[PDB]
Amino acid sequence: KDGFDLDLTYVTDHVIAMSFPSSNPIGEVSRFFKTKHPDKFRIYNLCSERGYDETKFDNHVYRVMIDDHNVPTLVDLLKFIDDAKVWMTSDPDHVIAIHCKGGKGRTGTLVSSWLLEDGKFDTAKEALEYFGSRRTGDVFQGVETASQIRYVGYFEKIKKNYGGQLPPMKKLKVTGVTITAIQGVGRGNGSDLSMQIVSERQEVLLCKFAEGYNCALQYDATDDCVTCEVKNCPVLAGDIKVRFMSTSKSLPRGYDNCPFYFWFNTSLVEGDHVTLKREEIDNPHKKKTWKIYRDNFTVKLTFS
Template identity: 50%
Template sequence: LIPSFIDFSNTSMPFFIIYVLSVRKSFSTYDSNIFSKISSESAFLPAEYFVISASKLSLPPLNCSLMATLSAGKESTCNAVDLACFSFEVHLIKIPYPHSSCPILCNPMDCSPNRLLCPWDFPGKNTREASESLKFEDENRVIYLFFENRNNVFIFLNFLFRTGVIFAILLICVDMALIIKDIIFFSGTIYISLESRLISLAIALFFFMDISLRVFIEGIQLYFSDIFNSLDAAIIIVTLLVDITYLFYDFTLTKIFPRLRIILQPVRLVILIRVFHLAHQKRHLEMLTRRMVSGNKRRYKKDGFDLDLTYVTERIIAMSFPSSGKQSFYRNPIKEVVRFLDTKHPNHYQVYNLCSERAYDPKYFHHRVHRYLIDDHNVPSLSEMVAFSMEVKEWMARDKDNVIVVHCKGGKGRTGTMVCAYLLASEIFATAEDSLYYFGERRTDKSTSSKFQGIETPSQNRFVEYFAMVKNIYNLTLPPIKKLTIRKIMIYSIHGVGKGNGHDLKLQIIMQRKTVFFCSASKNCRIFHDAETDRVIILLSNCPPLYDEVKVKFFSSSALPKYYDNCAFFFWFHMSFIQNNRLYLSRSELDNPHKTKAWKTYSPEFAVEVYFDDI
């Protein structure tokens, strides 16, 4: 959208770069005059860039129609991007082009130049539909820290809070009585009882630990940006130092410190206020711990809500498991999720629970809950992906206000797999790569961390690619059944993996949730180690016919790290897409070895190759 009063020729002015839409797509739904204007006056830029030049641009909030009046073209020029407002001082911002088919646009919900969204291409949609598709309702600026052992951290925090507040209030009452006694009845006596010193030290240590954890969670800069937090920390630290000094030193030779203590006694009354403040911080502490657990996943932090919940599109919501009981302290509380949905989308939402390992009473969501039983870090069947996509398409077609809410445990892997399937089925995206990239961008809040929060496991990525073929080749019907048996499996670069010769490995084949084959060095297979080529050859005997979704798991009697699925490594594939009776999977395509922390065990050349026989 290019307002006509912006001077493109004045290139000496500060400017910012904004992506309007993918340059490799057709411009048939947009005004060609705009693009000719851009191309003629910004020819020095790469094709992906469009430049808007201005020193300062300050406009009141504008709707699409008003923008159209200011624009050089027709109304269609603004429908593609419904910018809510321009109101900021323009700076030079270098934005790397993220993806060939996933451009970046300004967030219509924000006015600052650093707030960006990554929308999708719109094949087959008119500009009004494209515009409507860009209305998101989430908050990007959430500051929180990701911990590897985040659940344990929270359990400690939660225990500390629940017991600590009660403990602190009791100690404060005792300590205040001692302080008042010291102030009223102080007679210059230097001696202070050990009990009094220990009580004061316990209180000071408790609050010092509380401050330390808050600084650790929120960050030093953010925490101390609040003047009251700084004052709070100063009082606690001074009190702690005085109490430590009183505990370990004998003051029979000096009168300075007792007098200092009397001076500080009124100051320490401030701590009593802090206890009541902490009692009101329960909700805040819960929010912080939920942010720790969710990591840098994009959260909805608006209108009184703070949930691990993302609008993938305006009609697709991805979130973590809605929990109750103890888990609600570090995951989405189910009652808050219900309140959110009943407030934002009353009578127009449908929930999809993709967890096989946990459930909840569907009455919470007015019995609008559908379940697909998918194991954690594993894949749905293609038939489930097709059924889900068709069901969602039907639900969306009933009413333009209908939305879906999809979750697994963390709202990433299984959720992303199914959401990407629908994005492909509804033709929002044409390729698996684009849908995977888009989901990851929407689920990840890069303002807090660069950790990727999209679909991580290789098998889940592979099944999204399978589904793209089901959509594009088979028109959302399942491919013809192909039955094969596994003849041999070759493992490359085996050195350093367990014993390094493959004799510690065991193999399990799972099909339709049942173990159909198991082998080890002494049963159903022969294992050969070729030291010269650093590979292992496993020849299988009596392998049954395999078809549809197949899972191969490798166990080791050695101390190999176990990450997902309690095994050394595993992978899923679909038999109908096996070509030339061969499947080769590199380290990055195998579940568990794909993880960065596993690379010290699995070399870059580590790979598995499976050879099949026709029946």
């Protein structure tokens, strides 16, 4: 129309979400920002997996390293918010454009936190539905995973309860895991399952439930659940991902190459446990899986 053919959306007049500038061919995305926002744009590339020629955008590209179907570190989220705040407030015509690839999970985690920082919404849930409504009211139109939703909620908590800065440090050891509604999940008794805890991109603990490898499994058929005592957990600090793997052929992988997983940050855990409902766990949150993960499916981690 103005001669551009692009997956690009104005979420607001000064906040753009878009797809990856590939070589949207990069020469056209580049021409677009140089034509409609000359000297007044800043681009954010959220892809851990891929960069590009940032000189097509006059070197005004800020990188946040986020894995697809995952979350930024909370530190990186807050740094992004500071960088965008300085850019956005130094000139009424400055704009920010946010992207990775799918225009959706990673992009919506940062756009929705930005919309909270700018005061347009009071709650993560409204900012999330609002971004969902600009791409396509459902929070799962805003981002892809339950951890993405959690991290926008972490930003809201930081803003509201911790003065816009990180909370006092809390460190944890996982000593137990409990999974309810286990029938129908893999072998229905925990025996196909293992659990990996990942910190700073590395495995810090692996548990294999049938074998008692760093753990001991109890299956309670009456209560339709499994408990496992977790052994040898190192002290955990910061953003932690917990992944559950299965030897079972009937238990499919969703995102992240595993049946189900989640992120949490140790300083934002309340008390001695975290319990997540089905819609709060990555992969069981998708309705295509709700004959495997029933409505009372939950994962609880116990801490010391």
